[model samples]
Target: GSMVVKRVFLSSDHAGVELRLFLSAYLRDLGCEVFDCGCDPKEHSVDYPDYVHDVVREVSDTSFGVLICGTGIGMSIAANRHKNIRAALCSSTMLAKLSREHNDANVLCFGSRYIDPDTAQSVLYTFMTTAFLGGRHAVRVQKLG
Candidate 1:
């Protein structure tokens, strides 16, 4: 099969400055077109919902997103509130792979507090490389719309 390079949209709150920046470079290295949605400096206090909403709203069939916050739980909740978004908060590479394959998740959420840089890279790699399994899972994913 031919490889499809995804256009990835990313955003993070103040807690995830370093991780967000790192992932942007790392993703580009993996042949993805990356867009970094702001929350520039790691110093200020900002809300995760705003950033999460921004990224989630932009995801399309041809694009995917990554949202980062302290625990990733809040961002997941906020992202999933938008129509047509299935945001999955992944703690490991396995979860990242399964979420894309089984759930057809469009947004991958990460926690700066819980995950290290290495683990996050692994998760992103798995999420980006895994293709959605569309047999039985497609029916379920369609219901989400």
Candidate 2:
């Protein structure tokens, strides 16, 4: 159904926690179940890939992911390396929407330095709400595995 509850696995490094927190609450307001795979960098500066693995491992049917890092590139790279995980790092809401409709991205990545909390909110909302447009897109998404 269109209103299916989202099970979101969220993780972030030092640079990402702020936006990640906002998104966690945002998803909750939309009635999504949030699982925080947290390695809080408040203790110290932790590596991004480790947290990426934490989120990706939990991704599957009815579940999705959100990863954050300083530039967002690190999380995207690490998350995409895993099979069945199509993580999209987008600078704009348009690309975020396309990532779902075209690429069927199951994971979303964001850069704390580049985007403010407000922008990140709309972009992530687009990601979470957009539906995959399967056809040739599904074929291409299939080949990614």
Candidate 3:
């Protein structure tokens, strides 16, 4: 599919609340449309899988998605279970940048409990600004399926 960047779809489990809100506001301030597929206000006990599917599905057509959970692994695994989905689990800022630039990642997954808010913010910033280097990467990314 052709590359088209638009709104960022964000979702998270209760463990990701603070990071999610922080990233949402940051993206919004950067003039990005952020669709926060949520765990409604009432429950912190909501399952991570629900929001992962919700956000990934919402942004399936786009070239990017952002997801979060306690360690970032669960959300990525869950989202990948769906067809036509590539959820990149990111830890450091470098991983975040490379995931989008090389892997052509459509979804960015991070952990609230593991990564600090500042680092997470920086990763998200780099993720939004970086462009995919499609020449060689595209062919390799196609093998992900």
Candidate 4:
């Protein structure tokens, strides 16, 4: 039997909304459901905290979240507030893969402002495909909470 791929939770503030929408469509096309947490149209101003929490809460129950922001730093800070969330900010595909494989990161946060759409897409793709190595890494992840 094939393992089922679950929905990927996605959220973003005004700065990230456009990219968020792009990823949502991309993920859906790649065989994953995308639970988008509002902030549509992309040009308006919206707070990062609201979107971060939305993604984090979904992740607490569902186990995968992707958050985006102007710098992606604020989004990471906010999502990390949740005990069950291991959010990491990655600007490159290497960081994204390492975060999931080594850090066991459940929430991948990255700055749209710092990357071109193609590069960001590559990072997101890398993040989604990587799996946590578990073992000793599990012990370190538990200590963060």
Candidate 5:
């Protein structure tokens, strides 16, 4: 399928349930088509990579993704393993901006433990709105694939 700007794929493990839930609604209010590719682990703990792979697969088809975990490190690592994926672990709006502008990162990973609810919105908003500066960077990005 072709990339759709308003469409986003989201997923998280047990450790990130609250942040994941929060962002899902946040994205909906922005009028974006949110595809929540689950991991509603409830009270149980499960492997995060399972959920990471799920989102990564769909994220490639759609426009973007928002992944969350306790630290975000694991989620980004797993997501970046695939081709055509530039998953960026962002802790602030500046990082989110750079991720989109310089890296063209399609997936944004948030650390549930390190990020606050209100700040998350600003970071995500900037990420979704910023345009990729496809100049000489396009050639470098191509080498990743």
Candidate 6:
């Protein structure tokens, strides 16, 4: 049956603990199976690389990912190191939409410190729902790998 729930792997560092928890619950409410790759709910500081690695490793062709940090730059940079992982740091819904439709980004990165929770939620919604418009853009995304 083609009726199946999509899985999303979510992770973040101390700077993103609150937002991470918010997104995790939001995703669950929206009918997606979410795997939380954590850094503890107590907000203890942690290195972004380890949490980034956990999320990146779990992502597959059939799955998606979301990562958060203070600036989101570090998480995006580290996640992109893996083959086939197209991570995009986005602060707006437009950017999130374009990242998926144009770049075929499988990972959505957000800065908890830079954006309010409302914007983050909107960006996440766009990132999760958008599909790749794989026509001419397919060639460009192929170059990324």
TM-score of each: 0.93, 0.94, 0.88, 0.90, 0.93, 0.93
Off by over 4 Å in 4: 1-5, 60-62
Across residues 21-140, which tens digit of lDDT does each residue of candidate 1 receive? Answer: 999999888788899997877458898987876687679888899999999999899999987998999999889888988988889899998999999998888888888899999999
RMSD vs true structure, all candidates: 1.5, 1.6, 2.9, 2.5, 3.0, 2.6
Ranking by lDDT: 6, 1, 2, 5, 4, 3
Question: Candidate 3, residues 1-145: lDDT per residue as tens digits?
Answer: 2224668988888888878888889888877778878766466687788887677667654546888899998898998886677778887778867887787677889978888988888877777666778898888878775
Worst lDDT run of 10 residues, candidate 1, spans 1-10
- What lDDT score is found at residue 12 in candidate 5? 86
Give the better candidate number (2 or 6) by TM-score. Answer: 2
lDDT per model, in order? Answer: 0.87, 0.86, 0.79, 0.81, 0.84, 0.88
Steric clash count of candidate 2: 0
Candidate 6: the clashing residue pairs are none
Least accurate stretch of 10 residues (summed lDDT) in model 5?
1-10
Best by lDDT: 6
Q: Which pairs clash in model 3?
A: none
The predicted structure with the larger TM-score, 1 or 3, is 1
lDDT (Cα, tens digit) per residue for candidate 5, span 38-114: 78746468777888776777765347988988999999999999888999989899998888778889999999899
Per-model tally of clashing residue pairs: 0, 0, 0, 0, 0, 0
Q: Which pairs of residues collide in candidate 5?
A: none
Better of 4 and 6 by TM-score: 6
lDDT of 4: 0.81
| Residue 124, candidate 1: alpha-carbon lDDT | 85
Total residue pair clashes for candidate 6: 0
lDDT of 2 by residue, 1-145 (tens): 1532379999999888888888899889988899888867474588898788778888986889999998999999999999899999987999988998898898999998999998998888888888888988888899999
